[PDB]
Design a protein around this motif. Structure first.
Motif, PDB file in Angstrom:
ATOM      1  N   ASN B  50      48.902  -6.705 -44.269  1.00  0.00           N
ATOM      2  CA  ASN B  50      48.337  -7.655 -43.680  1.00  0.00           C
ATOM      3  C   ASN B  50      48.804  -8.306 -42.364  1.00  0.00           C
ATOM      4  O   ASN B  50      48.270  -9.022 -41.787  1.00  0.00           O
ATOM      5  CB  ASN B  50      48.194  -8.877 -44.800  1.00  0.00           C
ATOM      6  N   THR B  51      50.050  -7.866 -42.090  1.00  0.00           N
ATOM      7  CA  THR B  51      50.613  -8.065 -40.760  1.00  0.00           C
ATOM      8  C   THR B  51      49.937  -7.441 -39.601  1.00  0.00           C
ATOM      9  O   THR B  51      49.855  -7.874 -38.700  1.00  0.00           O
ATOM     10  CB  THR B  51      52.205  -7.703 -40.693  1.00  0.00           C
ATOM     11  N   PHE B  52      49.169  -6.414 -39.959  1.00  0.00           N
ATOM     12  CA  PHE B  52      48.444  -5.592 -39.197  1.00  0.00           C
ATOM     13  C   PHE B  52      47.004  -5.490 -39.231  1.00  0.00           C
ATOM     14  O   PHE B  52      46.176  -5.444 -38.486  1.00  0.00           O
ATOM     15  CB  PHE B  52      48.917  -4.026 -39.231  1.00  0.00           C
ATOM     16  N   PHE B  53      46.267  -5.854 -40.375  1.00  0.00           N
ATOM     17  CA  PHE B  53      45.188  -5.931 -40.906  1.00  0.00           C
ATOM     18  C   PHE B  53      44.570  -7.587 -41.535  1.00  0.00           C
ATOM     19  O   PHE B  53      45.336  -7.820 -42.350  1.00  0.00           O
ATOM     20  CB  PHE B  53      44.465  -5.009 -42.046  1.00  0.00           C
ATOM     21  N   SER B  54      43.422  -8.104 -40.880  1.00  0.00           N
ATOM     22  CA  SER B  54      43.081  -9.187 -41.572  1.00  0.00           C
ATOM     23  C   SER B  54      42.113  -8.508 -42.460  1.00  0.00           C
ATOM     24  O   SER B  54      41.837  -7.423 -42.543  1.00  0.00           O
ATOM     25  CB  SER B  54      42.339 -10.211 -40.636  1.00  0.00           C
ATOM     26  N   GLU B  55      41.581  -9.550 -43.349  1.00  0.00           N
ATOM     27  CA  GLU B  55      40.239  -9.231 -44.333  1.00  0.00           C
ATOM     28  C   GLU B  55      39.210 -10.130 -44.156  1.00  0.00           C
ATOM     29  O   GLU B  55      39.668 -11.464 -44.366  1.00  0.00           O
ATOM     30  CB  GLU B  55      40.900  -9.258 -45.796  1.00  0.00           C
ATOM     31  N   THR B  56      38.153  -9.600 -44.356  1.00  0.00           N
ATOM     32  CA  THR B  56      36.844 -10.474 -44.432  1.00  0.00           C
ATOM     33  C   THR B  56      36.414 -10.431 -45.876  1.00  0.00           C
ATOM     34  O   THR B  56      36.991  -9.580 -46.942  1.00  0.00           O
ATOM     35  CB  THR B  56      35.545  -9.759 -43.728  1.00  0.00           C
ATOM     36  N   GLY B  57      35.867 -11.398 -46.253  1.00  0.00           N
ATOM     37  CA  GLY B  57      34.950 -11.859 -47.336  1.00  0.00           C
ATOM     38  C   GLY B  57      34.409 -10.427 -48.303  1.00  0.00           C
ATOM     39  O   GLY B  57      34.480 -10.516 -49.332  1.00  0.00           O
ATOM     40  N   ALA B  58      33.665  -9.879 -47.376  1.00  0.00           N
ATOM     41  CA  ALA B  58      33.022  -8.325 -47.810  1.00  0.00           C
ATOM     42  C   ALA B  58      33.987  -7.209 -47.940  1.00  0.00           C
ATOM     43  O   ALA B  58      33.616  -6.265 -48.250  1.00  0.00           O
ATOM     44  CB  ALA B  58      32.022  -8.104 -46.625  1.00  0.00           C
ATOM     45  N   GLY B  59      35.417  -7.694 -48.114  1.00  0.00           N
ATOM     46  CA  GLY B  59      36.573  -6.625 -48.384  1.00  0.00           C
ATOM     47  C   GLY B  59      36.882  -5.771 -47.347  1.00  0.00           C
ATOM     48  O   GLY B  59      37.546  -4.694 -47.491  1.00  0.00           O
ATOM     49  N   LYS B  60      36.324  -5.735 -46.095  1.00  0.00           N
ATOM     50  CA  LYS B  60      36.719  -5.307 -44.809  1.00  0.00           C
ATOM     51  C   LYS B  60      38.076  -5.405 -43.966  1.00  0.00           C
ATOM     52  O   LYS B  60      38.274  -6.620 -44.108  1.00  0.00           O
ATOM     53  CB  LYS B  60      35.470  -5.084 -43.556  1.00  0.00           C
ATOM     54  N   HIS B  61      38.901  -4.524 -44.031  1.00  0.00           N
ATOM     55  CA  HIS B  61      40.088  -4.820 -43.342  1.00  0.00           C
ATOM     56  C   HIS B  61      40.287  -4.426 -42.239  1.00  0.00           C
ATOM     57  O   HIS B  61      39.776  -2.908 -41.538  1.00  0.00           O
ATOM     58  CB  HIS B  61      41.244  -4.013 -44.148  1.00  0.00           C
ATOM     59  N   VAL B  62      40.361  -5.279 -40.953  1.00  0.00           N
ATOM     60  CA  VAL B  62      40.166  -5.427 -39.728  1.00  0.00           C
ATOM     61  C   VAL B  62      41.336  -5.240 -39.160  1.00  0.00           C
ATOM     62  O   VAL B  62      42.296  -6.107 -39.117  1.00  0.00           O
ATOM     63  CB  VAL B  62      39.179  -6.526 -39.306  1.00  0.00           C
ATOM     64  N   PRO B  63      41.743  -4.128 -38.033  1.00  0.00           N
ATOM     65  CA  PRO B  63      42.930  -4.215 -37.211  1.00  0.00           C
ATOM     66  C   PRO B  63      42.801  -5.500 -36.409  1.00  0.00           C
ATOM     67  O   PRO B  63      42.177  -6.070 -35.879  1.00  0.00           O
ATOM     68  CB  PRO B  63      42.556  -3.145 -36.192  1.00  0.00           C
ATOM     69  N   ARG B  64      44.360  -6.250 -36.548  1.00  0.00           N
ATOM     70  CA  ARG B  64      44.475  -7.487 -35.529  1.00  0.00           C
ATOM     71  C   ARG B  64      44.783  -6.718 -34.146  1.00  0.00           C
ATOM     72  O   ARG B  64      46.048  -6.635 -33.845  1.00  0.00           O
ATOM     73  CB  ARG B  64      45.735  -8.174 -36.127  1.00  0.00           C
ATOM     74  N   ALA B  65      43.779  -6.439 -33.480  1.00  0.00           N
ATOM     75  CA  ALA B  65      43.894  -5.472 -32.357  1.00  0.00           C
ATOM     76  C   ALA B  65      42.889  -5.912 -31.499  1.00  0.00           C
ATOM     77  O   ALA B  65      41.821  -6.334 -31.510  1.00  0.00           O
ATOM     78  CB  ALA B  65      43.790  -4.193 -32.591  1.00  0.00           C
ATOM     79  N   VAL B  66      43.051  -6.000 -29.939  1.00  0.00           N
ATOM     80  CA  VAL B  66      42.284  -5.916 -28.799  1.00  0.00           C
ATOM     81  C   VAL B  66      42.371  -4.783 -28.043  1.00  0.00           C
ATOM     82  O   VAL B  66      43.330  -4.422 -27.897  1.00  0.00           O
ATOM     83  CB  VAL B  66      42.230  -7.155 -28.190  1.00  0.00           C
TER      84      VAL B  66
END
Ligand SMILES: Nc1nc2c(ncn2[C@@H]2O[C@H](COP(=O)(O)OP(=O)(O)OP(=O)(O)O)[C@@H](O)[C@H]2O)c(=O)[nH]1
Ligand SMILES: Nc1nc2c(ncn2[C@@H]2O[C@H](COP(=O)(O)OP(=O)(O)O)[C@@H](O)[C@H]2O)c(=O)[nH]1
Ligand SMILES: COc1ccc(N(C)c2cc(=O)oc3ccccc23)cc1O
Ligand SMILES: [Ca+2]
Ligand SMILES: [Mg+2]
Ligand SMILES: [Mg+2]
Lengths: 428, 440
Positions: B50-66
């Motif tokens: 989780n240091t690198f991925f956030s999570e949506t309610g739908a279970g998607k792991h999203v890069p903390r990235a731009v």
């Protein structure tokens, strides 16, 4: 003078702290839930020194758990005796101290210290007659070291007539996390010299070497180091915890062990030296205990006792043995080595006995020495400090938190003063 | 906590970012749609990854990235590629005109038009963090955007986040795969501009990586894709301590305490082993001693320089896979009686060690053999200054004649910015000399 308040700060502080409570709870008949299930009256008579009595009828450690990071304390909570601690006595921040004494003492620690003192106050208010405090911490990190020494100064301000006692783990390059350890230790020693009444120098160098040379563990872990610490800690507090012919408290320890207020750094020792798992079946004789407890190889501070003199010694023998033979052997070792004991403090070696041995042993001896040889420890840290400090190496980690180099120069001078103050009594 | 936000700037930054995030997904069992079956806490959690991925309610792991580029065609490939569902469209930001290989356009003319939007999107990520630790910034030294836009962003980040840590992965230019003759100018300009704003920077010399692909993986003419796969392994090694937990795991921040003796001396040399083809790894097991030894082979370094001819100020070993401290200690003791390892006299000589137990992963259809155990060494050596000396010399050759300078002046820059940048570089080379001199 009945109640001791225990504080454990930072990773090392909390790890050695948790182990101390595991060991002494076992010795006192207390189980993880707080229930007494032992068969000796000696186990309960002085249990109020370390334990609060909840109507339960449960025994709750008078212990406050402190860290700037949650990790180690979560580990304590899910550890063997984890459930025994009063959950309100877990005081933790989130940011950590980054092995940085300035963060612990001035910036991050400053933010958390008041809530720790609130918990200290609640425990102190519930005391019949508070003896004072014991702190476990290391000197090489940020929290135990910077914040631990901050706590000590704030505890002294609010309770200037109570005793402050520490178990202070000294860093060693042999078991090292960061290069800045000597900085953190020197800053911390400066504090300890002024604001503790008595400090056990638990030297990671000595613990390492014992594990390697004596216990034949080719690669020592923190767990192996801590086995030695908890056995030593159990030993040195025996006379605070159990009724005997000499009934001690933190003040009487200080009066009798400390002839000059700054020279309060003790070299502890233990015999027989054992590891976890593989343990000896061969019982020890009183002459063997006595010989081993005084051997350099059994000391928890990496100093050569022959390079100095003992100002004072307290020795504690545990198990069923001949007290007559104890007295004889203790007198024997003094009479045969009397150049190593200062001749201007009569009767400076004191022995006490307790019938209850520690877990897994028939008999044991614990050593508490105030030796002028402890100067070797401080000189070692000083050399390491100066090697970096002469080039101002790694200093930006501290100046970034608002410290000035003057403060390093001052702490170095005070630690060098301590060293030459030891050298002064080693000659006369 | 403690969250890290990655910022990928320009073509090199973005393409390296692709390779890194693809590999992270493989290491953590995250699918191309962001689903991670083994993650039982839906829509959140404070696990290591989780240091690198956030999570949506739908279970998607999203890069903390731009991902930011001043031109759209590299980022368009992320938008339409394999990992397109991983990122919210607002994380992928593009202008219309590039910097045309010109630092002045990246920092000023074109960069200034998109910088407030970039900081808005970064702010959106930072607001979702409970204990933001800092930023990891990926860019080339040589590109107009990788140099000029990165230096603008770093300056702005210092303003908006204070002393919050900023780390770089910086692509140092090589002739074999370079794109512009003005890369030396852009390199010195960004290096000078960024120096006070960065806490630690990992340089990756394209020529070192190009050589390694050629010699160790038998690739005749390595492409960016070949280079990036290798770079991502090295990046993964460095960030592994943040993304996994384990008893012998040691946090990157704790390595940093040892690696940065003075604020400007913040450029660790990375060395990685083993890099080996499937063909050669077959029936050949590389032990802890073997891969540790390979760390002191200059051919395995991410930057071309010679540490045997400089002094060490720190040595860190970051192991992953099947590795126990007993073997490490044995390997180190052997190395310490056999190699050219000289430390400066003001620093202790002990190597700092971390071990993560998760073995290295490889991307399908790649060149690297899957191995049981790998190591990244991070050293602070005075030798890294060779890389500066080479780049400063190239800068001097052109600048003495003011070749190409009018392209920068034409965009608003002055000669005094070049000479100021260059002087800061001379002072840096001087700093690396001074730290290597014995104490009095
Ligand atoms: N290792 C590696 N280097 C790259 C990659 N892409 C570009 N480079 C290098 O980056 C430098 C050129 O900078 P780029 O990042 O392409 O340029 P930019 O940041 O997009 O800037 P402009 O296109 O000028 O606006 C050269 O030294 C290239 O070799 C890549 O995917 N991997
Ligand atoms: N004996 C012993 N030493 C430790 C332990 N944990 C850390 N250390 C030592 O403590 C120092 C680092 O301090 P630490 O307590 O980890 O940092 P803190 O959490 O900021 O106080 C170093 O000198 C380590 O060798 C432990 O469990 N036992
Ligand atoms: C001397 O260094 C260079 C010269 C040119 C270029 N670029 C951008 C080219 C532009 C183009 O339209 O046609 C090309 C065909 C072949 C090679 C380059 C170019 C890049 C360079 O480093
Ligand atoms: Ca989750
Ligand atoms: Mg620690
Ligand atoms: Mg581009």
């Amino acid at each position: 003078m009945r109640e001791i308040v225990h504080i454990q700060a930072g990773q090392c502080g909390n790890q050695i702290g948790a182990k101390f409570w595991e060991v002494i709870s076992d010795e006192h008949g207390i189980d993880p839930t707080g229930s007494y299930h032992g068969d000796s009256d000696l186990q309960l008579e002085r249990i109020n020194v370390y334990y609060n009595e909840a109507t339960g009828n449960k025994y709750v450690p008078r212990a406050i758990l402190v860290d700037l990071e949650p990790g180690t304390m979560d580990s304590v909570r899910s550890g063997p005796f984890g459930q025994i601690f009063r959950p309100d006595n877990f005081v933790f921040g989130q940011s950590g101290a980054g092995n940085n004494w300035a963060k612990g003492h001035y910036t991050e620690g400053a933010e958390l210290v008041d809530s720790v003192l609130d918990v200290v106050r609640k425990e102190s208010e519930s005391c019949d007659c508070l003896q004072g405090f014991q702190l476990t911490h290391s000197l090489g990190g940020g929290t135990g070291s910077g914040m631990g020494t901050l706590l000590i100064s704030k505890i002294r301000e609010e309770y200037p007539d109570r005793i402050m006692n520490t178990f202070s783990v000294m860093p060693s390059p042999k078991v090292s996390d960061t290069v800045v350890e000597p900085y953190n230790a020197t800053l911390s020693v400066h504090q300890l010299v002024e604001n503790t009444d008595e400090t056990y120098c638990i030297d990671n160098e000595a613990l390492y070497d014992i594990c390697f040379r004596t216990l034949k563990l080719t690669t020592p872990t923190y767990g192996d180091l801590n086995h030695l610490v908890s056995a030593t800690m159990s030993g040195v507090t025996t006379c605070l915890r159990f009724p005997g012919q000499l009934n001690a408290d933190l003040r009487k320890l200080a009066v009798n062990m400390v002839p000059f207020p700054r020279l309060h750094f003790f070299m502890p020792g233990f015999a027989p030296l054992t590891s976890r798992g593989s343990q000896q079946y061969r019982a020890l004789t009183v002459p063997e205990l006595t010989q081993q407890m005084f051997d350099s190889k059994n000391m928890m501070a990496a100093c050569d006792p022959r390079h100095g003199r003992y100002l004072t010694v307290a020795a504690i023998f545990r198990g069923r043995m001949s007290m007559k033979e104890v007295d004889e052997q203790m007198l024997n070792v003094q009479n045969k080595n009397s150049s190593y004991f200062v001749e201007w403090i009569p009767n400076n070696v004191k022995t006490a006995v307790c019938d209850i041995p520690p877990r897994g042993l028939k008999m044991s001896a614990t050593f508490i020495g105030n030796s002028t040889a402890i100067q070797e420890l401080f000189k070692r840290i000083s050399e390491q400090f100066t090697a970096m400090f002469r080039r101002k190496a790694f200093l930006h980690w501290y100046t970034g938190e608002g410290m000035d180099e003057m403060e390093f120069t001052e702490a170095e001078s005070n630690m060098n003063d301590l060293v030459s103050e030891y050298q002064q009594y080693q000659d006369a | 906590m403690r969250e890290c936000i990655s910022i990928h700037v320009g073509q090199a930054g973005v393409q390296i970012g692709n390779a890194c995030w693809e590999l992270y997904c493989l290491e953590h069992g995250i699918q191309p749609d962001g689903q991670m079956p083994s993650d039982k806490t839906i829509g959140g959690g404070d696990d290591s990854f989780n240091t690198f991925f956030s999570e949506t309610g739908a279970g998607k792991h999203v890069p903390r990235a731009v991902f930011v580029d001043l031109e759209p065609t590299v980022i368009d490939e992320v938008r339409t590629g394999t990992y397109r569902q991983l990122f919210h469209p607002e994380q992928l930001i593009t202008g219309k005109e590039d910097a045309a290989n010109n630092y002045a356009r990246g920092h000023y003319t074109i960069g200034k038009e998109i910088i407030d939007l970039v900081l808005d999107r970064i702010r959106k990520l930072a607001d979702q963090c409970t204990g933001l630790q800092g930023f990891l910034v990926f860019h080339s030294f040589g590109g107009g955007t990788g140099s000029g836009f990165t230096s603008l962003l770093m300056e702005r980040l210092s303003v908006d986040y204070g002393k919050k840590s900023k780390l770089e992965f910086s692509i140092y230019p090589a002739p074999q795969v370079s794109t512009a003759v003005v890369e030396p100018y852009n390199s010195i300009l960004t290096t000078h501009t960024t120096l006070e704003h960065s806490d630690c920077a990992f340089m990756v010399d394209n020529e070192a990586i190009y050589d390694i692909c050629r010699r160790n993986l038998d690739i005749e003419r390595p492409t960016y894709t070949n280079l990036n796969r290798l770079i991502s392994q090295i990046v993964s090694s460095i960030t592994a301590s943040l993304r996994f937990d384990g008893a012998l795991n040691v946090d990157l921040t704790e390595f940093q305490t040892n690696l940065v003796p003075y604020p400007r001396i913040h450029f660790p040399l990375a060395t990685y082993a083993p890099v080996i083809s499937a063909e050669k790894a077959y029936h050949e097991q590389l032990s802890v001693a073997e891969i540790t030894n390979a760390c002191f082979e200059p051919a395995n370094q991410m930057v071309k320089c010679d540490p045997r001819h400089g002094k060490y100020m720190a040595c860190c070993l970051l192991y992953r896979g099947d590795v126990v401290p007993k073997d490490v200690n044995a390997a180190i003791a052997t190395i310490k009686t056999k190699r050219s390892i000289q430390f400066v006299d003001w620093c202790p000589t002990g190597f700092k060690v971390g071990i993560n137990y998760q073995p290295p992963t490889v991307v399908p259809g790649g060149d690297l053999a899957k191995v049981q155990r790998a190591v990244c060494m991070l050293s602070n050596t005075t030798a890294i200054a060779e890389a500066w000396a080479r780049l400063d010399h190239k800068f001097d050759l052109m600048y003495a004649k003011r070749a190409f300078v009018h392209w920068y002046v034409g965009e608003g820059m002055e000669e005094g910015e070049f000479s100021e940048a260059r002087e800061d570089m001379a002072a840096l080379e001087k700093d690396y000399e001074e730290v290597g001199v014995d104490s009095v």
